[PDB]
Design a protein around this ligand. Sequence first.
Ligand code: 118
Ligand SMILES: [Mg+2]
Ligand SMILES: [Mg+2]
Lengths: 68, 1339, 502
Amino acid sequence: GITKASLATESFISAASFQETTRVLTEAAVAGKRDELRGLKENVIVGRLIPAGTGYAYHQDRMRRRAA
Amino acid sequence: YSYTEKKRIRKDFGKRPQVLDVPYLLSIQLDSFQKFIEQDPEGQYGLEAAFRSVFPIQSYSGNSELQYVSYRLGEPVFDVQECQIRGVTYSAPLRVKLRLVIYEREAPEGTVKDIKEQEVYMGEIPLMTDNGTFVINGTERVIVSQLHRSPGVFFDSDKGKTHSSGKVLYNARIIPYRGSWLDFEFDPKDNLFVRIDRRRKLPATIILRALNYTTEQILDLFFEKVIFEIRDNKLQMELVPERLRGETASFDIEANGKVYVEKGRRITARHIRQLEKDDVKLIEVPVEYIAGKVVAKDYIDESTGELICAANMELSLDLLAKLSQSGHKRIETLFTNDLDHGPYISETLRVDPTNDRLSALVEIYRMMRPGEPPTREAAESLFENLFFSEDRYDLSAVGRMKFNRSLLREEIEGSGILSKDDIIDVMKKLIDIRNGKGEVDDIDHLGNRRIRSVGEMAENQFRVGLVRVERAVKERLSLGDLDTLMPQDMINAKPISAAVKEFFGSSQLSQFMDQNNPLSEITHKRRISALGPGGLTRERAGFEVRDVHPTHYGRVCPIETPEGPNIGLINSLSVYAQTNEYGFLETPYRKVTDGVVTDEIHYLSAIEEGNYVIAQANSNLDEEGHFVEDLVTCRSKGESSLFSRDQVDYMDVSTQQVVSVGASLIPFLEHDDANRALMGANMQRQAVPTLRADKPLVGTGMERAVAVDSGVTAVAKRGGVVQYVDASRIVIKVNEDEMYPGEAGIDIYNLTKYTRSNQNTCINQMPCVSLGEPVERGDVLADGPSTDLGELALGQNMRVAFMPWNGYNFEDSILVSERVVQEDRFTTIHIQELACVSRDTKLGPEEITADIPNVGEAALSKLDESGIVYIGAEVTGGDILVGKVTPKGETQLTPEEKLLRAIFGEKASDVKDSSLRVPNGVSGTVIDVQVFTRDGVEKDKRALEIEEMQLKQAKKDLSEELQILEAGLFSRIRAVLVAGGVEAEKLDKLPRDRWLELGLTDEEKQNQLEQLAEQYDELKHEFEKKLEAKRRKITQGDDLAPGVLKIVKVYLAVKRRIQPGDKMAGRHGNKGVISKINPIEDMPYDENGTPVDIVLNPLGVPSRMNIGQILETHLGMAAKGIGDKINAMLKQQQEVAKLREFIQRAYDLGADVRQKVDLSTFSDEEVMRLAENLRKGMPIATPVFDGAKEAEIKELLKLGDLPTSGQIRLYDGRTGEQFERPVTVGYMYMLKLNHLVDDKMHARSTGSYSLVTQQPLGGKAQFGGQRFGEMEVWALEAYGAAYTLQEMLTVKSDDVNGRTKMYKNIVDGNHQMEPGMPESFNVLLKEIRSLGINIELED
Amino acid sequence: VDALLDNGRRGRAITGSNKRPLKSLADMIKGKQGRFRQNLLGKRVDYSGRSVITVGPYLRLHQCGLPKKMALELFKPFIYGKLELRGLATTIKAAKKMVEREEAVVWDILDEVIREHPVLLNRAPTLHRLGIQAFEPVLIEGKAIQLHPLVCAAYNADFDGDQMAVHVPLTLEAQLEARALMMSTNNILSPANGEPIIVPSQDVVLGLYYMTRDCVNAKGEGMVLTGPKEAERLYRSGLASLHARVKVRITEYEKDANGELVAKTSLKDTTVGRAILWMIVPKGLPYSIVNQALGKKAISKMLNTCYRILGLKPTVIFADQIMYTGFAYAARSGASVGIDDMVIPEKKHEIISEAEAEVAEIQEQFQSGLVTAGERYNKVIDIWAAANDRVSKAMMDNLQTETVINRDGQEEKQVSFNSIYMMADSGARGSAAQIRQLAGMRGLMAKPDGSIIETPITANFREGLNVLQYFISTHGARKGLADTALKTANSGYLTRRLVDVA
RNA sequence: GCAG
Ligand code: 118
Ligand SMILES: [Mg+2]
Ligand SMILES: [Mg+2]
């Protein structure tokens, strides 16, 4: 369901800003997770361009200049 | 009539004759507080009951005691207006006379060694003003009545909403007034459990074993026995035949004869009657009839002493054999027949692990105080402190009444603590409800909900403060200083006063009063609230408590309620609703004796109302009392049905009995949908008072009541003649009938001029009477805010046309003419108070001064030499009102600023401009300045000027009251002196002060002269001691807050005129925002040239079905059509015969109205005065649900020579050609609501930023910044607006280095951002790293 | 330490000095008030204002009316920039003083700096992405934002006290996103279904419905017209009614298979009003699109047809022209609601007396025990529901064709020109379900627990509800209002869960 | 307490 799928993202920042912050943050902490900031909530939280729309070109440039 | 009601008589269209006039609308507040503070020798109410509830206070050892003899309220230090000015509570000191009795050391009684009796001050209790308000910290607050669940026992269920089997599970709940809740409930296995304070549940027989009942006594209480007695052989069984109702016997029944029912055949009531006709008392059943039967006694051996079977032990044939061997020919056994007598108690006697009372007390201890080892002496004290000590459990008088009423006892009074009997009876009634012979209580029934009001909540808080002080005085009385201390040395007034202080100031129910108009006040006082302390929460309050119940009829308004998250929780009391002495709402009905409706009213509560059958108010009846019909619509059980005319028991007392006071003012309420009626009722209370109050052309008849029963007006206390009248006072010369002996006989009414309401409107009283005019007891002498000649008037009578006009009244907009602005119709005065506080800072004190740095002498032109603005100054936004400078240090100029000041030499100033300025956009007149100086700070020239003006005014007011009163005394002395020994040629020349001592022939008249001279001497003694009190209250220094040196409050008066954006409305829920202020010549106009004042949208009527607003238009055109007829007759100057004839034809119109205005009894002066007051439209009265029919509206339309369809043809004002269809034109009553666009418009480019996270601050008071919430961020993510979003996050809001770069980039003309990280993300990272979690940013 | 990190998780919360629990480190970052939701996912924003919205129907689709007093403050750095750039101020402090004094040149500078600079208008709740839209500002004198009418349906805005928040796109990228992604002339279709969301409503659709109807013997009937211009000349001269059925020569263009427009010309049988309305129809559209009585659905389909055939740019001009002509001809009609417009059928009292006879028969049959209270109640409900539908049919049949007028002497019935019926039938406001309660009976009500009361409200709002029927009415009205109040929090939480899963 |  949409709640258990929102909290089972690969991003602890999305899932931690949705709800149940304590569970998401403790699980991510003991697992030592790494949030690669791929969605839109992680890029709104850190004040970056969202990877969708007019900020899609910039993120593609970012993933063509750092993977190579 | 009156003399104030035949000035302008409202034409009443109501037809039902009224038998009960509307009561005092503020009886709830005034009666509650009067119960609280009045002396009560019986000791049941208020402070006396609260004192007897705590006192006497024995010591721990009983050697001494503190008893209470009496209390007494002091006089208030400041009157109400001084309390509103100085910002202090209006309260009275509670001085209580206590007595410390010291007994002796060795005495058979503890005889009195000493008594020390003295009067100790404990606290100040706030005082209800004479309008039902409290002035608490200078603001007027209303303590709202609460609607809470009555104490008592409440049986309820959950209707199969557990365990998916659809099994209804019952639960009783004992709720006390104070103390621990006690619930009993059933589980899905039919086992009775118990909870105490909603913590985990125990088997219910544990609370039965904590009371000293054994298992045998428990089985005795909850059951009856089928006695098996062993006669000669074959297990004879005693038979009570009704125990055999409705079963299938496993065996045929043979008693001395006939076989009644064979094996496996079902038993019906014929078989029971047959067995009792045979008088069967004995059976011999198969032996396996005892396979499953539970013994009901403790059956032990006499031979071997072995306990064969104790109680609650299921029997078997082997047990039967070993039990019969001991000479036990008597076997008592439980009778549990399925579906009518369950095993629930005998089933729970197996689920509880407890065997004895001490183990049960231990188990209750373990549930209550877990983890702590239970000892006997504490487990058996916890239980008798739970429900059985008056110190900790009070079921109260309402609790005991509802308790015994629920258990069908005949005594309504008793002890406030529980008993064995009460708990056992509650369990019995719960078991009865399980066995289908009971019914659960409806928890939203208004017999189960109770009005707890101001004088009861205030007493509860006072008694909490009293127990706080009495624990300390018990702690102090058991010390050994006991001989030399007085009772006021052990009483601390600060806990007691702090309890009532936090109640009156900080409770949820102690609310800032609505003071828009009189309706807002008088409906804030009649307000019921489910919320509050001890009530619901608006989030957790369900759907069912928010609904209108059938017992709300006549007790609580169905329509006047809020519309947002607390709907159905804030209620309004209906017009006639009272409260019981217990607090349950009750409403009056007329008794129907034999089919004749008596005029004897009975106040029925919600439970009594459901027994009788009760006619409607619309039920017709002839003048004999009899119902002219024979099948009457009535309500009998909350169900509504038709009944005969001889089943009818009561009748509703009025047609407006069902609605509140605010909904009683909507004409044609019966035509509005209930949603639009709710909105109209709620938007009548937001209507601001305009410059000139305008009566409603179409009222309902409650306008006089609302205007008088709210204290906004000045009503004559005794009748008389207006001796003097003036814009600020009215001096009434009382009739000789109504004045007391030895009295001046003069009433002074000091009107209130241009004061601030809580909503910053102005509350200003204008004298309604003119000079030399006779007034009576009860007439309105002064129109307050929003009243016109004693009638509540909240808006103006605008001429509306219903037509779509060129897009300008699209979607609830309103197109206003310009003549509504020229004529200052909706122009309202708003008064703001602005305070400039000169404080003491650590770098020196702030000073109020006119030598302000960096400000030219053009801005300081309105300030006087004290630095304060001049009274009467027309200021605008940005003007300095109170010049104040702050000392500052830490200057630290930049290198460039250092060079700039070494070039020009203009040095920096050591003070910083901290002035008070008019807020932006505000433009008004300073009308008042008040200066408060801390004692010890020297007053400037202006504070001394203001003090000298106040002393001049105090002396002038008190000398003028003495002049008026002494002139009245001398007129009364002159009247008495000429009643015998006439001096009419002598009296007017002798010096008047010798009339005080002129000895006349004493028949009895010299006694009256003695009393009149005593009156004059007392007035001369009293004026001086009032003036000296006023001088010492004026010149005394102020108790300011700590740190502040002085406070300058400046009062601006802003006339706000109507303008596009201002939200207007009507009485029918037809709100709307003004879209355009249209020229006069653009408005649509009729054939006579009269343009329309307001063009409304007709599409707003049919979907939201408030049809009433159309009828009020059609009637409002009829009424004006009468007015502009009378107006014509006053310009041609017709004789008063023609005017009298036409006005009589207008007041006699209507089909069987209740009023008769026969103005042949009117003089010609009275007819011309009435015809002058009716020349602006004749006011109509359309009582709610009884109003003017459509045919009466058409008949009055025909009398004014208007078209009976209500629709005239209009021409376009712009093109001069006719609109192709007739247009509804009439006069609606438009209200200007307090949502003015001047107060809503806000804008901010840059401003002040929040402290922890660096985002903009919140509201337009702090220069705001709008919240770009989560949903708007989604809306920008849904477009691809990544850059707009990234600037909403970084540089508009949080980026501290990016916001200033963006500012200087915009100023440079370079619209480019350099976004960083939001500061709040850094705050978050630091707040997660402080949790011991290393959150990082991977480069 | 456990109370510092997460207060109240183990056992009892620590309350300090208020008997109100202490806000721990975990409560700073968690919940509806934590950093994540209060401060990171949405925040307070500079260059933003707020005011009451009001109509302004003169506007074009892409512009709002922004008060000068709000625009002077939201655009303050822009004005300081242009004030120094144009040499009117020597220093940004001099410019600050100039805009504080509101000198007459800062109003010309302000007209310069808002010129092609869009603003975002936002109404909360921003339920869907058309809750924020960019408009070009037009400086007005009031204090209320003037919102073009066609966009209101997208914002869910009525002018009964609604307020909207203004935001300023600062950079060039944000200005071009407001121009290119969010401008209201780009959002004419709904992102949910494809249907037009910038669509005419209550006043416009009533004006266009009244214009495109036909009366039987209307003034100037049957004449032959050279074109739509002659129809407009006749109607403005008063020589032909707006509903006169006439014969007009209409030239219309079809899109050829290649993409170009080809003309055709034919005498159509129209009315004068459909001819007048043809003058605003863009070219590539058939004449059959206006040659009918245009309700709400016909106008929404007309706009959709223009969008699919001709594209966005002619549709925007078309929609504004529709709004102006609908507002104008709604004003010309004077379509007003009077109390005689709610015509109650005269067979209502007879229908209700027959239904009362039937229920009394069922009651005295229940006294005869042949029916249980259950089927007695069920049959009484069904023989009141049949009465309610008979009343509603009699009302609507009496209402919808009550115009019986003459052609060459002989009477003939037509669709009604009743105002209530024109409003219900246009789709402007209301439905037959509300005309039912105005003029029929308002029917059976339900108790608060859902079980419907066995005797209906036999009265309607043109007559009075008596006090008991009104009480019964409030039973369900407060249930609907409380449902509305407590289901917005139930829907907003679903929306939040869906946005966070997707 | 209220506004939409
Ligand atoms: C705490 C407890 C209950 C609710 Sb709610 C509610 C919400 C907004 C306005 C009024 C009420 C509620 C609970 C019980 C009965 C009735 C209402 C609520 C719960 C789930 C989804 C949406 C709202 C919210 C917070
Ligand atoms: Mg709205
Ligand atoms: Mg609140």
